[PDB]
Amino acid sequence: KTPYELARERMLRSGLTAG
Amino acid sequence: KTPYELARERMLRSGLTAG
Amino acid sequence: KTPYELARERMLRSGLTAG
Amino acid sequence: KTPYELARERMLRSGLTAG
Amino acid sequence: KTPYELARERMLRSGLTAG
Amino acid sequence: LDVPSSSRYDHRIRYVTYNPADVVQVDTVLGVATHIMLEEGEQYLTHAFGDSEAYAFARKGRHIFIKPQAELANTNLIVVTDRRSYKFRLQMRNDRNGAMYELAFRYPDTQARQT
Amino acid sequence: LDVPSSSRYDHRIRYVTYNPADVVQVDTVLGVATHIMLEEGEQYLTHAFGDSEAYAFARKGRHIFIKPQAELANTNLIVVTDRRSYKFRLQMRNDRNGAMYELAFRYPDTQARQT
Amino acid sequence: LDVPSSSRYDHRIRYVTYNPADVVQVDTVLGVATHIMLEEGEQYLTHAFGDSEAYAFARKGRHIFIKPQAELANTNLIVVTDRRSYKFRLQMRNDRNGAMYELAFRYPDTQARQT
Amino acid sequence: LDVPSSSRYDHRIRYVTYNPADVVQVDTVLGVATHIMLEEGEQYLTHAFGDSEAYAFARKGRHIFIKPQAELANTNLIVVTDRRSYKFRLQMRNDRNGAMYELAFRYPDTQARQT
């Protein structure tokens, strides 16, 4: 799990607005 | 489970509008 | 977990205003 | 725990007014 | 845990006003 | 396929002329949100994705934001309003270059109706 | 890409002229909060990040604070208001130098409307 | 960077002239609380730290106290009010010397408005 | 640093002249309570320790008692009121000699205002 892969997964998961 | 197969299953499962 | 790494994680976690 | 050490800890712990 | 280290941690933890 | 035309200042702001018999090619890269903005006073009825799970849709009035939330997110979006129906061809870009930050429509039908 | 112009006193206070067909390059370093301040009386409608989880957004009226909360936080922010829509290109800086503490806009469109 | 100027009696009481295009260098040592005191009748809206967890913020009207609560607490504080916005550069000092017990502002803009 | 001047009867009762641009050196020994007494009719707003856990604070109107509750209790106290703000430098003494039982202020600013 390289930092780039973790960033890519975070980009996939996150919504448009938090909360 | 190649990424293309996962995409194909996701295309099958998903509805027209989410929520 | 060097102190610099701990500081970096704390910077990531903390919000803009506490409480 | 010599009596002087116990006294020193008691001085540290106690508040300004009891109750 | 030398007394100086304990004092340093206490300085970090404590708030501005107690209670 | 309408391929939107970029601005002269930034290539991330693109303009397309609405044509009811044509679809719009939207190039969505990973991790950006595209601002799709409808006509003033246009009332949004319904939309429909090819994948509800590939893309994220948020709307506030006439402001529509989309964002790819899955790998290989090649679908279409058909957002229908009171006046017209918009058909987009959302095709995810693999190298995260050439993003589109805002899509803006030029309606010649309303200008013709004014003419 | 609008790259904001620094002040003459401190390089942490930057000024940019609002242009509706261009985006603003915001260099966010780790552990600082950037003050983005909109026009007076401008009503905020909605915003949209590339990553809701990479950046922290706080707003109080027309005062907008953002802060990177994750590694490699390269996204975009599109905060839309009653009058205009702002498009930022938040690009995290890796060496924690050259921060931006405040971004301030110069609107030539309202000055032209006054003219 | 405004570096505040010490008093002639004690070096722990420092004075700085407010400048809207510059930030203030605050040297916070471990285990002291710094008194930052705003203008009379100035209404505090919001603030934003680089780290909410590195520093402790307490406010009572126009009196603002901060105190480092973590190691390597290098952030910024942007406290915004009705009249102006203050930008501080809180940089923790490692040897616990040269503390700042009170920061007091001299506003030349209000004096100019009176002039 | 204002170092308070002892009485002629007992060295445990000390007097200091209030100066807004200077701090007061308070030598707190273990196990004694120091009586700090503010001006008549002065309304206490807020205070702030360097360590809330090193010292114990009790107030009843204008009477303020402090007492060290931990080892190596070197902090500062900034008690702010309606009229002025007092800044003390509480430095714990290691040999439990030369205590201060009461600190009393002489205000020359109010006498000057009367003059």
Side-chain angles (χ1 to χ4, degrees):
Chain A
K1 269 308 163 57
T2 192
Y4 182 60
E5 278 179 20
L6 271 193
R8 257 191 73 91
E9 317 297 352
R10 165 172 47 80
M11 272 159 209
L12 271 43
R13 303 190 300 71
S14 44
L16 273 163
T17 63
Chain B
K1 269 308 163 57
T2 192
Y4 182 60
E5 278 179 20
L6 271 193
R8 257 191 72 91
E9 317 297 352
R10 165 172 47 80
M11 272 158 209
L12 271 43
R13 303 190 300 71
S14 44
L16 273 163
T17 63
Chain C
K1 269 308 163 57
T2 192
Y4 182 60
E5 278 179 20
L6 271 193
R8 257 191 73 91
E9 317 297 352
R10 165 172 47 80
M11 272 158 209
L12 271 43
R13 303 190 300 72
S14 44
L16 273 163
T17 63
Chain D
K1 269 308 163 57
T2 192
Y4 182 60
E5 278 179 20
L6 271 193
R8 257 191 73 91
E9 317 297 352
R10 165 172 47 80
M11 272 158 209
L12 271 43
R13 303 190 300 71
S14 44
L16 273 163
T17 63
Chain E
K1 269 308 163 57
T2 192
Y4 182 60
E5 278 179 20
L6 271 193
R8 257 191 73 91
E9 317 297 352
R10 165 172 47 80
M11 272 158 209
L12 271 43
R13 303 190 300 72
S14 44
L16 273 163
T17 63
Chain F
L1 264 168
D2 266 343
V3 55
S5 179
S6 304
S7 312
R8 65 181 294 275
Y9 300 102
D10 206 26
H11 75 267
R12 273 160 277 250
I13 311 302
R14 293 180 181 177
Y15 304 120
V16 63
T17 79
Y18 179 79
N19 191 239
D22 191 358
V23 307
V24 168
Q25 167 80 45
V26 173
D27 291 331
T28 56
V29 299
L30 179 70
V32 305
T34 304
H35 184 215
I36 306 171
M37 64 180 288
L38 316 183
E39 201 185 14
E40 293 182 354
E42 204 177 308
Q43 186 71 37
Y44 155 89
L45 265 70
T46 310
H47 80 286
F49 279 99
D51 291 331
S52 294
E53 301 185 356
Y55 280 88
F57 187 86
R59 188 202 45 111
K60 182 68 180 294
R62 49 178 276 261
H63 297 294
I64 281 157
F65 304 99
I66 55 171
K67 169 210 188 320
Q69 283 172 167
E71 289 270 10
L72 296 170
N74 298 294
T75 48
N76 73 324
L77 172 61
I78 305 176
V79 62
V80 298
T81 60
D82 266 330
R83 293 182 230 191
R84 48 189 82 77
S85 167
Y86 306 92
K87 304 152 285 265
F88 308 103
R89 194 221 181 180
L90 316 166
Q91 193 170 9
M92 190 151 157
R93 275 201 41 101
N94 51 4
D95 54 355
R96 199 187 212 278
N97 283 320
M100 182 186 318
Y101 279 34
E102 181 146 320
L103 186 52
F105 284 95
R106 288 149 162 48
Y107 306 97
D109 54 357
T110 77
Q111 182 184 350
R113 189 184 64 182
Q114 281 196 4
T115 299
Chain G
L1 264 168
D2 266 344
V3 55
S5 179
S6 304
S7 312
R8 65 181 294 275
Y9 300 102
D10 206 26
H11 75 267
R12 273 160 278 250
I13 311 302
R14 293 180 181 177
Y15 304 120
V16 63
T17 79
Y18 179 79
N19 191 239
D22 191 358
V23 307
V24 168
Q25 167 80 45
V26 173
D27 291 331
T28 56
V29 299
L30 179 70
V32 305
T34 304
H35 184 215
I36 306 171
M37 64 180 288
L38 316 183
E39 201 185 14
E40 293 182 354
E42 204 177 308
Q43 186 71 37
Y44 155 89
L45 265 70
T46 310
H47 80 286
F49 279 99
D51 291 331
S52 294
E53 301 185 356
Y55 280 88
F57 187 86
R59 188 202 45 111
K60 182 68 180 294
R62 49 178 276 261
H63 297 294
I64 281 157
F65 304 99
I66 55 171
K67 169 210 188 320
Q69 283 172 167
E71 289 270 10
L72 297 170
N74 298 294
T75 48
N76 73 324
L77 172 61
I78 305 176
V79 62
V80 298
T81 60
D82 266 330
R83 293 182 230 191
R84 48 189 82 77
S85 167
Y86 307 92
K87 304 152 285 265
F88 307 103
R89 194 221 181 180
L90 316 166
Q91 193 170 9
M92 190 151 157
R93 275 201 41 101
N94 51 4
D95 54 355
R96 199 187 212 278
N97 283 320
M100 182 186 318
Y101 279 34
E102 181 145 320
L103 186 52
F105 284 95
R106 288 149 162 48
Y107 307 97
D109 54 357
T110 77
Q111 182 184 350
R113 189 184 64 182
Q114 281 197 4
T115 299
Chain H
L1 264 168
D2 266 343
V3 55
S5 179
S6 304
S7 312
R8 65 181 294 275
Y9 300 102
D10 206 26
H11 75 267
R12 273 160 278 250
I13 311 302
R14 293 180 181 177
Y15 304 120
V16 63
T17 79
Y18 179 79
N19 191 239
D22 191 358
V23 307
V24 168
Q25 167 80 45
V26 173
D27 291 331
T28 56
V29 299
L30 179 70
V32 305
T34 304
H35 184 215
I36 306 171
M37 64 180 288
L38 316 183
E39 201 185 14
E40 293 182 354
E42 204 177 308
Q43 186 71 37
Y44 155 89
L45 265 70
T46 310
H47 80 286
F49 279 99
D51 291 331
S52 294
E53 302 185 356
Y55 280 88
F57 187 86
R59 188 202 45 112
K60 182 68 180 294
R62 49 178 276 261
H63 297 294
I64 281 157
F65 304 99
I66 55 171
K67 169 210 188 320
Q69 283 172 167
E71 289 270 10
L72 297 170
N74 298 294
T75 48
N76 73 324
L77 172 61
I78 305 176
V79 62
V80 298
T81 60
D82 266 330
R83 293 182 230 191
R84 48 189 82 77
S85 167
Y86 306 92
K87 304 152 285 265
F88 308 103
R89 194 221 181 180
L90 316 166
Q91 193 170 9
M92 190 151 157
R93 275 201 41 101
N94 51 4
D95 54 355
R96 199 187 212 278
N97 283 320
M100 182 186 318
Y101 279 34
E102 181 145 320
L103 186 52
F105 284 95
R106 288 149 162 48
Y107 307 97
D109 54 357
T110 77
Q111 182 184 350
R113 189 184 64 182
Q114 281 196 4
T115 299
Chain I
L1 264 168
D2 266 343
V3 55
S5 179
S6 304
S7 312
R8 65 181 294 275
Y9 300 102
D10 206 26
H11 75 267
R12 273 160 278 250
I13 311 302
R14 293 180 181 177
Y15 304 120
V16 63
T17 79
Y18 179 79
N19 191 239
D22 191 358
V23 307
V24 168
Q25 167 80 45
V26 173
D27 291 331
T28 56
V29 299
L30 179 70
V32 305
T34 304
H35 184 215
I36 306 171
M37 64 180 288
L38 316 183
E39 201 185 14
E40 293 182 354
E42 204 177 308
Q43 186 71 37
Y44 155 89
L45 265 70
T46 310
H47 80 286
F49 279 99
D51 291 331
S52 294
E53 301 185 356
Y55 280 88
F57 187 86
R59 188 202 45 111
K60 182 68 180 294
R62 49 178 276 261
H63 297 294
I64 281 157
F65 304 99
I66 55 171
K67 169 210 188 320
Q69 283 172 167
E71 289 270 10
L72 297 170
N74 298 294
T75 47
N76 73 324
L77 172 61
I78 305 176
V79 62
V80 298
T81 60
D82 266 330
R83 294 182 230 191
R84 48 189 82 77
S85 167
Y86 306 92
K87 304 152 285 265
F88 307 103
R89 194 221 181 181
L90 316 166
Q91 193 169 9
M92 190 151 157
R93 275 201 41 101
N94 51 4
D95 54 355
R96 199 187 212 278
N97 283 320
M100 182 186 318
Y101 279 34
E102 181 145 320
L103 186 52
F105 284 95
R106 288 149 162 48
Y107 307 97
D109 54 357
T110 77
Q111 182 184 350
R113 189 184 64 182
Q114 281 197 3
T115 299

